[PDB]
Design a protein around this ligand. Structure first.
Ligand SMILES: C[C@@]1(F)[C@H](O)[C@@H](COP(=O)(O)OP(=O)(O)O)O[C@H]1n1ccc(=O)[nH]c1=O
Ligand SMILES: [Cl-]
Ligand SMILES: [Mn+2]
Ligand SMILES: [Mn+2]
Ligand SMILES: [Mn+2]
Length: 535
RNA sequence: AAAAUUU
RNA sequence: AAUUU
């Protein structure tokens, strides 16, 4: 029936110039050697991406879908949710959000400039006066950085971003933000994945696994999920939004946004030309995560019931999920997962890689991460969250005139502090760099390097500084990724760390704490690391 | 471009 | 600001 896109033939123009790396990457040329592998997806590649995501959809629902959907509205109606004052919505706008076509940008919106506020008022009138006229959208390519992978293609084509003018974005917020805050949690309960910390993901997954007499797990992801979303799916999304308690004024705006923005519309490139027309999810709308998550959750629970999955326990973050089920023997488990996949495909959410049942928690990847295990100080098992380091290390090497990766380094250090690759590689480099710069004191992205031991303990527990005997998988994968990027192997990082440490210690102060906590793995005679007053 | 988490 | 979807 519905085609996901149609294309005029107009280019997908760049929204400003997309920078090149330089001949010298001074911050990262001691991190790794193979900078030729580190690239940023350009708008040149956008054409290819479109070809991949433009395709015909044929949804076919059934009793299981219909029944799940029913249950989800009886959930929805316990939610009452309100409008957001034009002002409050303006306040929620990000500081650097792309400026409006009508001569104002996010400074003005957040500072409640008069021109901005009027224009927004008029936009919201038109939403109320008019529930059919399609709202124009802009289409741009996303700039992510990756390592090349000649296994899976050379270089990925750029993801497509589709969004309305800033005025419309504010209005969306007025109508829906409150919903986004309440609905999913209400509908999916514990299954709603974006509620949890990394640590709670891990505990949740473990509680799940442990509760089964004979657990079986698997993950699923949908291929180009946004383009698999059907006009109908979106309307079904609306009909769930509506199922709450709502100011009549909302309903009108929601319904109006649904029909004018969410189910489709014309797309324009940055140069102004008509680019195509869209009949699936737009990436750049307020409802994207909520939508994806809810919709994916419906289809998945339906597919679960179709396929026979016993005692499923789910976790959903957008198009990504994990189900931990009672195993029905491998012969049947293989059969049920085929069924699941057929069902999902009938619902128009077919997978990239077909899923597979697994019976070891380390072998289930989702949202690009997984659970692994190591031993802590007293010799007990410690489960934690990790991931292939390839991309993090690639992004660690993205240095241009505009961009510096030092923030990225730190970002990953915090999120993945217990991982062997953060502890041995990133930390070591990060500190080594700042000691030489002599810029330990400086707060980066509103965080101070010398707090780190505190911040990590607060978040990952003290065992994060004492962990050892990492898993085969994890050692194999780290080593492999360092070779791939032309980085020194771990033995070399051991050396560099020892040096960084001694130097950190000798400097004394909050420094020497860092030296002693963060790098205790690096030394022959370990130390009695005790809790830190701060967290 | 949007959200969530982390800070 | 970091990461993810
Ligand atoms: C565009 C999506 F709908 C996308 O289709 C969906 C699923 O994410 P995934 O990373 O699996 O990518 P695809 O499924 O290939 O789109 O999540 C949304 N998404 C993703 C990446 C992103 O920077 N922003 C975003 O809004
Ligand atoms: Cl322990
Ligand atoms: Mn996907
Ligand atoms: Mn309606
Ligand atoms: Mn995904």
């Amino acid at each position: 029936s519905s085609m996901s896109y149609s294309w005029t033939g107009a280019l997908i123009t760049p929204c400003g110039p997309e920078e090149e790396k330089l001949p010298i990457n001074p911050l990262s040329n001691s991190l790794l050697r193979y900078h030729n592998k580190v690239y940023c997806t350009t708008s040149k590649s956008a054409s290819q991406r479109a070809k991949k995501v433009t395709f015909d959809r044929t949804q076919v629902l059934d009793a299981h879908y219909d029944s799940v959907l029913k249950d989800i509205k009886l959930a929805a109606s316990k939610v009452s949710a309100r409008l957001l004052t034009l002002q409050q919505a303006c306040q929620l706008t990000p500081p650097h959000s792309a400026r409006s076509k009508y001569g104002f940008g996010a400074k003005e919106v957040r500072s409640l400039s008069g021109r901005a506020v009027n224009h927004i008022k008029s936009v919201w009138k038109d939403l109320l006066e008019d529930p059919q006229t399609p709202i124009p959208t802009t289409i741009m390519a996303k700039n992510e950085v990756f390592c090349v992978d000649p296994a899976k293609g050379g270089k990925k084509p750029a993801r497509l971003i589709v969004y309305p003018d800033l005025g419309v974005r504010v209005c969306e917020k007025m109508a829906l933000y409150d919903i986004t805050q309440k609905l999913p949690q209400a509908v999916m309960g514990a299954s709603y994945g974006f509620q949890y910390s990394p640590a709670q993901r891990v505990e949740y997954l473990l509680k799940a696994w442990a509760e089964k007499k004979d657990p079986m797990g698997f993950s699923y992801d949908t291929r180009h999920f946004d383009s698999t979303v059907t006009e109908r799916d979106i309307r079904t999304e609306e009909s769930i939004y509506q199922a709450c308690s709502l100011p009549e004024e909302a309903r009108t705006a929601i319904h109006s946004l649904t029909e004018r923005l969410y189910v489709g519309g014309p797309m324009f490139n940055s140069k102004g030309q008509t680019c195509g027309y869209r009949r699936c999810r737009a990436s750049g709308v307020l409802t994207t995560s909520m939508g994806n998550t809810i919709t994916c959750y419906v289809k998945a629970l339906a597919a679960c019931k179709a396929a026979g999955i016993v005692a499923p326990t789910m976790l959903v973050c957008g198009d990504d999920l994990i189900v931990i089920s009672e195993s029905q023997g491998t012969e049947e488990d293989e059969r049920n997962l085929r069924a699941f996949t057929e069902a999902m495909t009938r619902y128009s959410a077919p997978p990239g890689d077909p899923p597979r049942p697994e019976y070891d928690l380390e072998l289930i990847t989702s949202c690009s991460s997984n659970v692994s295990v190591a031993l802590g100080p007293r010799g007990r098992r410690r489960y934690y969250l990790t991931r292939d380091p390839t991309t993090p290390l690639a992004r660690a090497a993205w240095e241009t005139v505009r961009h510096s990766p030092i923030n990225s380094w730190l970002g990953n250090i915090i999120q993945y502090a217990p991982t062997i690759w953060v502890r041995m590689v990133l930390m070591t480099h990060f500190f080594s760099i700042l000691m030489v710069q002599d810029t330990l004191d400086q707060n980066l992205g509103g965080v101070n390097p010398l707090d780190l031991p505190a911040i990590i303990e607060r978040l990952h527990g003290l065992d994060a500084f004492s962990m050892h005997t990492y898993s085969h998988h994890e050692l194999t994968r780290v080593a492999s990724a360092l070779r791939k990027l032309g980085a020194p192997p771990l033995r070399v990082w051991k050396s560099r760390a020892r040096a960084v440490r001694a130097s950190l210690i000798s400097r004394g102060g909050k420094a020497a704490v860092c030296g002693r906590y963060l790098f205790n793995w690096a030394v022959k005679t370990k130390l009695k690391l005790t809790p830190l007053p701060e967290a």
